[PDB]
Structure 1
Amino acid sequence: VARDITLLECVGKGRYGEVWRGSWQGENVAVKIFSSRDEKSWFRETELYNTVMLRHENILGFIASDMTSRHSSTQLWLITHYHEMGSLYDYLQLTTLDTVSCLRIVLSIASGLAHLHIEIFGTQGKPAIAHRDLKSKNILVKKNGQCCIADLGLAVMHSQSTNQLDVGNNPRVGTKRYMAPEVLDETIQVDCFDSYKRVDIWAFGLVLWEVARRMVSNGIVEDYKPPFYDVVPNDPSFEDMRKVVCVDQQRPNIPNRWFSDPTLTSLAKLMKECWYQNPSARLTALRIKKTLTKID
């Protein structure tokens, strides 16, 4: 089917490869073409899409995964639904948010992440899945104002039936800017599936921060900024992050104007419960989901 996709324009590009707006069967599609060095991620994401029943409103839906030759060389493609509003990263720089829009975004993400983390038994079930590269560029905004989570190339899996933690075999590591302290300082218990969920929760708190900044209260709003924008450069090194997060113990600042708004007050408390040093102390995805469902 890759043969029948017309590529229209590149809408994203990095070390991972490229993403194109494509045309297939009269519809827009997104086509990720992986770079020659990220093949293990293609393989992992193709694995999940072909073996795990993983359909959910807030998880990017796959159309197909192909191996195609483009002028005497094999490319690995992932074809998915196309979301014209773009990633959450771009969207937040192009608009501000009201309370309703802000809460739909962060609840839809929590709902997606809770569905990954929870094992489902029986016929149409799935193992537990930790994401491990959660960030605002890996979240797409839908026209209905909810989001969906993309990029399963680092997923780890677990099934209670087995002692079996399925970590794959991918040299890729998570985005440094969003790595939790226990990943930066290499004390993460790599044999414990729960450790990976607590890493997703750390990174979720950062996304929550990023989105809350863009909700208007009392007529004012903060500029879009990425986590730790003030203390690390662009493309921060491993050591930059370790210094800020581990040695200096820093966390994103809460703007004072948030305390004059009850929603932002509740989101401030929530995000700080994603950031405890002790990974065991952090909220679960399901607790976040429930809490955001009650926030008004």
Structure 2
Amino acid sequence: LEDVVIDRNLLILGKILGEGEFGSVMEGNLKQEDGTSLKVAVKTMAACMKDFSHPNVMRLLGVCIEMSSPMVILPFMKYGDLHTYLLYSRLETGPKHIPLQTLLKFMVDIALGMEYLSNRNFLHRDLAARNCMLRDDMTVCVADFPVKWIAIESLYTSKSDVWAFGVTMWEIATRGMTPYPGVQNHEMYDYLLHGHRLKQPEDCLDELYEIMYSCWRTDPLDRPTFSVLRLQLEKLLESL
């Protein structure tokens, strides 16, 4: 089924950007049909992605299969994963102090991305700040289609995706804290069973904590939809 394939000679691979599940993600140059070349990311060593068109969801540029003796091509995200970008924001090199409105925009971006995928009845199954990438224009898009992001009942529906989104909201609000400090992975199921949740971050609004807390209700049906979540975050952002 090769409607999305690209000729291998149009692609030039280069240095490593990160490590995915099945192999290395490399930087690359893709020669386009209009003659010009574009910087790309190439996972090495997709059917879902072909069906997606939305700003806050990573798109498929193509596929290549080189023979030795496959590679999925994706857009280059110049600031990398969101988790690592948040960590750097607490030091002094690349980005400055990120204000509250910019963190909410990251949350809104992800919510929009998930709203779209949720309407297609597509389940992410791995939503986290490390799986959210940063475009050259500072917009976030969800990508990659881990015990502390999985919900109670899942130990998967669209509401277990909502749980993981709440955890990702917490990650962004804490600027890259690992969830559940002083709690081990084996310990999680019982920690959640007794009704304990991620604690409210430091200088973080009650309105915001209400929203992320609502993602972790015991009953999946009590959680809000991504569209409900998206509006709550958008209106909270507007009130600053």
Class of the TM-score when normalised by the shorter of the 2 chains: 0.7 to 0.9
Q: Could you give the per-residue CA deviations for residues 135-181 of structure 1, whole angstroms, max 9, x where no partner exists?
A: 111110123332001112xxxxxxxxxxxxxxxxxxxxxx3231111
Aligned residue number for residue 81 of structure 2: 87
1:30 and 1:256, CA in 2 relative to 1: closer, same or farther beyond 3 A?
closer
* TM-score (normalizing by structure 2): 0.84
The 5 A counterparts of 1:1-296 are 1-25=7-31, 26-34=37-45, 46-50=46-50, 52=51, 54-69=52-67, 71-72=68-69, 76-95=70-89, 96-118=97-119, 127-152=120-145, 175-184=146-155, 196-214=157-175, 224-232=176-184, 236=185, 239-246=186-193, 248-258=194-204, 264-295=205-236, 296=239
Shift of 1:104: 1.1
Assess if the C-alpha contact under 8 Å between 2:28 and 2:40 holds in 1: yes
| Amino acid in the other structure paired with 1:111 | L
Aligned residue number for residue 41 of structure 1: none
SS where residue 203 of structure 2 aligns? helix
Q: Could you give the per-residue CA deviations for residues 209-239 of structure 1, whole angstroms, max 9, x where no partner exists?
A: 111123xxxxxxxxx312224312xxx4xx3
1:294 and 1:32, CA in 2 relative to 1: closer, same or farther beyond 3 A?
same
SS where residue 58 of structure 2 aligns? coil
Shift of 1:14: 4.6
Assess if the C-alpha contact under 8 Å between 1:212 and 1:267 holds in 2: no
**Count of aligned pairs:** 219
Shift of 1:130: 1.5
1:99 and 1:231, CA in 2 relative to 1: closer, same or farther beyond 3 A?
same
- The gaps in structure 2 that reach 5 residues or longer are 1-6, 32-36, 90-96
Aligned residue number for residue 221 of structure 1: none
Assess if the C-alpha contact under 8 Å between 2:40 and 2:75 holds in 1: yes
Aligned residue number for residue 155 of structure 1: none
Assess if the C-alpha contact under 8 Å between 2:83 and 2:172 holds in 1: no
The root-mean-square deviation of aligned C-alpha atoms, in Å, is 1.9
Taking only the aligned residue pairs, the percentage that are identical comes to: 26
* TM-score (normalizing by structure 1): 0.69
SS where residue 201 of structure 1 aligns? helix
1:271 and 1:19, CA in 2 relative to 1: closer, same or farther beyond 3 A?
same
- The gaps in structure 1 that reach 5 residues or longer are 35-45, 119-126, 153-174, 185-194, 215-223, 259-263
Assess if the C-alpha contact under 8 Å between 2:20 and 2:43 holds in 1: no
Q: Could you give the per-residue CA deviations for residues 44-97 of structure 1, whole angstroms, max 9, x where no partner exists?
A: xx32234x2x1000000110023322x32xxx2110101110001111111142
Report the Cα distance in structure 2 between the residues aligned to 1:147 and 1:131, rounded to whole angstroms. 16
